[PDB]
């Protein structure tokens, strides 16, 4: 038969399942809704482990339970009473013999030890992957240290001592590759001559590589804490989502820089060379699976100042028109082709983050926090699972590093790019549009001629890499 359980009066996690406290979806069960007590029971269940559930729960629980309360509940879960001796044990003891204690030994082996180990696994995952709770609440960290540091008994000892050390390391807190990265490529600007760095003087291959390293690092820095609760949209977004906002602001700045390079090149022939170079950079972004970079370029080419430049468009080579068209088609029909391509490539890649943001926000906004059943309010856990499916996808693409060498001067050049200067956004984008009208006026105004501004060769070195010995 099944093991007997402690009385629900002394141990709250032994209450029977009912539709008043847990609802399952239609081979482990998937929880649709439940009380916090039932969620924590299933988080630390004696019959099976559920590492996905641990990640989902630790990512999303603050929408229904405070960190201090979670710790109290898992400590309560850990403190399981042992059963009293059975009749057979009693009779042995009365005869001066040692009891077999068969039921007690089974309950220790099959209930207490798995539940306690799974509580410790929650603690371990909490500290390793969601340490911000403890960074933001020093008293919570003290309580966790005290709980772990006072667990007795040899069965848990290896993990107790390990978790103690992990906590201490987290308080005061290297890549290997299958091959060598390719050689850094140089064009007109030579190494160390940062004052000449520009769109046409850096090698287009190396522009795309260094922007991909930068954008990959920005992508990889975004933690789920910046996303759950839609906090990047709220009044404290600069406090709660700084890495996400830094990533988005880089993307915006690069798009505006591409637009500024185009419309400030007043000579038609030179502006064609600028646009052609940008589409070559886009080609390398595609080769590197840097989808953020691909869309940075597409957004610039679809912007109001650039889109209308028909005289420039007319001179772009047909093959480059095709490259830009197939990049734009990734975004059509609500990113249908982008989503399929992301799911087919071999990482490393740099996803476009905006789709994730919209899907997290709409999942949060479009589903209720609780479900009302039989007069009880149950936590709607399916909504949280959906959010954590998105944060899990994000994290999956954050693991793989690019095998490309950093060029510190090129990296600094793009880190410090500031196309808007001291201008406000409206002032600057009006300026870009007025430049567009200046260099290619609306019909029937005649097309003016403008002097060249670049003194160096406009011919691209191309985007196929070179390899000396």
């Amino acid at each position: 038969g099944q093991m007997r359980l402690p009385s629900a009066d002394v141990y709250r996690f032994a209450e029977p399942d009912s539709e008043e406290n847990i609802i399952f979806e239609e081979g482990i069960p998937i929880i649709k809704a439940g009380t916090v007590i039932k969620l924590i029971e299933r988080l630390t269940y004696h019959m099976y482990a559920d590492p996905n559930f641990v990640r989902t729960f630790l990512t999303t629980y603050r929408s229904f339970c405070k960190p201090q309360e979670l710790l109290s509940l898992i400590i309560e879960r850990f403190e399981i009473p042992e059963p009293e001796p059975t009749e057979a044990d009693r009779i042995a003891i009365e005869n001066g013999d040692q009891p077999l204690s068969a039921e007690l030994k089974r309950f220790r082996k099959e209930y207490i030890q798995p539940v306690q180990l799974r509580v410790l696994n929650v603690c371990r995952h909490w500290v390793e992957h969601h340490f911000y709770d403890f960074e933001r609440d020093a008293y919570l960290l003290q309580r966790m240290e005290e709980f772990i540091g006072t667990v007795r008994g040899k069965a848990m000892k290896k993990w107790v001592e390990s978790i103690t050390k992990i906590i201490q390391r987290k308080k005061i807190a290297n890549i290997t590759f299958q091959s060598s990265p390719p050689t850094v490529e140089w064009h007109i600007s030579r190494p160390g001559h940062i004052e000449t760095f520009d769109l046409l003087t850096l090698h287009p291959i190396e522009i795309a590589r260094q922007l991909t390293l930068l954008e990959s690092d920005l992508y990889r820095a975004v933690q789920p804490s910046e996303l759950v609760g839609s906090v990047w949209t709220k009044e404290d977004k600069e406090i709660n989502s700084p890495n996400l906002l830094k990533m988005i602001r880089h993307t915006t700045n690069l798009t505006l820089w591409f637009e500024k390079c185009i419309v400030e090149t007043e000579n038609l022939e030179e502006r064609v060379a600028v646009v052609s170079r940008i589409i070559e950079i886009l080609q390398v972004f595609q080769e590197l699976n840097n989808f953020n970079g691909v869309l940075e370029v597409v957004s610039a080419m679809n912007s109001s100042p650039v889109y209308r430049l028909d005289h420039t468009f007319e001179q772009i080579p047909s093959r480059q028109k095709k490259i830009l068209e197939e990049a734009h088609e990734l975004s059509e029909d609500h990113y249908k082709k982008y989503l399929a391509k992301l799911r087919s490539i071999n990482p490393p890649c740099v996803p476009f983050f905006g789709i994730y943001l919209t899907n997290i926000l709409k999942t949060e906004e479009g589903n209720p926090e609780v479900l009302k059943r039989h007069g009880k309010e149950l936590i709607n856990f399916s909504k949280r699972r959906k959010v954590a499916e998105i944060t899990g996808e994000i994290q999956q693409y954050q693991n793989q590093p690019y095998c490309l060498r950093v060029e510190s001067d090129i990296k600094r050049f793009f880190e410090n790019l500031n196309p808007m200067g001291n201008s406000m956004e409206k002032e600057f984008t009006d300026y870009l549009f007025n430049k567009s009208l200046e260099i290619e006026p609306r019909n029937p105004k005649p097309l003016p001629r403008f002097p060249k501004k670049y003194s160096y060769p406009l011919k691209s070195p191309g985007v196929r890499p070179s390899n000396p010995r």
């Binding site: 839609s230 990047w232 949209t233 709220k234 009044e235 977004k237 906002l245 988005i248 602001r249 993307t251 915006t252 798009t255 505006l256 637009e259 869309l295 597409v298 957004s299 610039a300 679809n302 912007s303 109001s304 889109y307 209308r308 975004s331 609500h334 249908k336 905006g354 943001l357 919209t358 899907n359 997290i360 926000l361 709409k362 999942t363 906004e365 479009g366 589903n367 209720p368 959906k386 998105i390 956004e425 409206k426 549009f433």
Partner: protein, 167 residues
């Protein structure tokens, strides 16, 4: 076959804008949503006895990608310009959204509706009359909606379709 209308929702972030399309497209009567499922943003409707397909673009959450606005707006035939009735800044943002739409579409007469959205029980700071006056100065309809009761939601989208049909 039936006409498809590409509608675009624009407006300030962080003030419940997304509830407009969610409530429309929703199982009206089951408060639930998976935005990831292909065609959680397409809805077949009958407006004045004529069946059509609404394809709604709502990039709520991407407001900080400000250089993508042109790219997203370019896809649309008609626009819902949404502000929150308890957020005066979102109302003051409307003028620049409208100017940007006119620029992207290269037209002074783009089908659009002004939508005042009640997203919580916090005190209203934009009165109906202020928003009506603004809409009239633009020559466009004004619809107020609730983010919780679905009131006004069908009126907002159907009014926009009528603006497109009568353009």
């Amino acid at each position: 076959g039936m006409t498809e209308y590409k509608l675009v929702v624009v407006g300030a972030g962080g003030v419940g804008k997304s509830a407009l399309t969610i409530q429309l497209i929703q199982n009206h009567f089951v408060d639930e949503y998976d935005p990831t499922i292909e065609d959680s943003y397409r809805k077949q409707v009958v407006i004045d006895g004529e069946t059509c397909l609404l394809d709604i673009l709502d990039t709520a959450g991407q407001e900080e990608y400000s250089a993508m606005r042109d790219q997203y707006m370019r896809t649309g035939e008609g626009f819902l310009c949404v502000f929150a009735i308890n957020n005066t800044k979102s109302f003051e943002d409307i003028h620049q959204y409208r100017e940007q739409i006119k620029r992207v579409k290269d037209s002074d007469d783009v089908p659009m509706v002004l939508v005042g959205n009640k997203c919580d029980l916090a005190a209203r700071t934009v009165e109906s009359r202020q928003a009506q006056d603004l809409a009239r100065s633009y020559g466009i309809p004004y619809i107020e909606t609730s983010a919780k009761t679905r009131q006004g939601v069908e009126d907002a989208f159907y009014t926009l379709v009528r603006e497109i049909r009568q353009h």
